[PDB]
Design a protein around this ligand. Sequence first.
Ligand SMILES: Cc1cccc(Sc2nc(N3CCN(c4ccccn4)CC3)nc3[nH]cnc23)c1
Ligand SMILES: [Mg+2]
Ligand SMILES: [Zn+2]
Length: 314
Amino acid sequence: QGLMQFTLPVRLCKEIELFHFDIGPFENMWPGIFVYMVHRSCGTSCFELEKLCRFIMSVKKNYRRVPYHNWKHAVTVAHCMYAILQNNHTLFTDLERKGLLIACLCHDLDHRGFSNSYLQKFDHPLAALYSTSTMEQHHFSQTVSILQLEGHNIFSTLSSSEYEQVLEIIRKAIIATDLALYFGNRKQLEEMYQTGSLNLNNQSHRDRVIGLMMTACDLCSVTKLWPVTKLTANDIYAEFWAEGDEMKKLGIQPIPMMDRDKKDEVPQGQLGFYNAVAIPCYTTLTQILPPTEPLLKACRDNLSQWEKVIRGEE
Ligand SMILES: Cc1cccc(Sc2nc(N3CCN(c4ccccn4)CC3)nc3[nH]cnc23)c1
Ligand SMILES: [Mg+2]
Ligand SMILES: [Zn+2]
């Protein structure tokens, strides 16, 4: 370090502050985008540059060459969190700002392009090791492994106390990415918000709010400009349909979302997803963190584009 500020070209310097920023097709610029985001979000002092680069490059190595749950998804999910953190300056601790960008970059480590359900039906060894939130417990395990490599401990300067707390923020943040757990989390957050019992001093409340941030960042393809949203859906389905194929090989009719023979049902299925998951997620997030409103607005714009697809207006 330490007078070594990372900088981005003008168009990226400006648009990286916006929720809808797409990190672009130059894979080699994504590490520098991430460090940029950490330095602005956290400080140039929060991590040793040399250790952080070595950490980022080992995380990159442990993402696989799958259509969707790949390195680009990691960095995309970290960028959405950066936008939330940067629009809610004073709401988060020093430990949270550190923990959360790392959690996001690590949240799908070593993903195989398959659901928890497929692992359980296949009888994968990971389904015996972790009976629920199977892949998410794996992702946390891989994060701790990489942190324990020589010269990769980016948290070396924290106390024993602060280190346990940061690894506990990261653990809960990664587990929250199990969508099966989002529905209950959001229903509790909506009841708390509306009875006026939400209290950001209650750690148990903070945990829930961070959980919803994680879902919101994880689903963020639905908050992009329509051409990004549409082209990302193709990647998401390329994985799901491959899973459907593997389900057919185990002798199981997959759900239509994973059946490439039911492509025609994609538009109507998107409407359900927006209405059942995405719109409620960003609505509750906006209630708790009003400056995240542009995520909800973008999502509502993308629901309207899928409505037009169904009407054959595209
Ligand atoms: C942005 C995006 C694009 C593709 C997939 C997802 S994840 C996802 N999508 C849905 N939806 C959408 C897909 N939908 C169908 C149905 C028939 C055919 C095609 N699609 C079924 C409900 N339901 C879910 N339940 C748990 N996770 C999901 C997100
Ligand atoms: Mg995941
Ligand atoms: Zn993810």
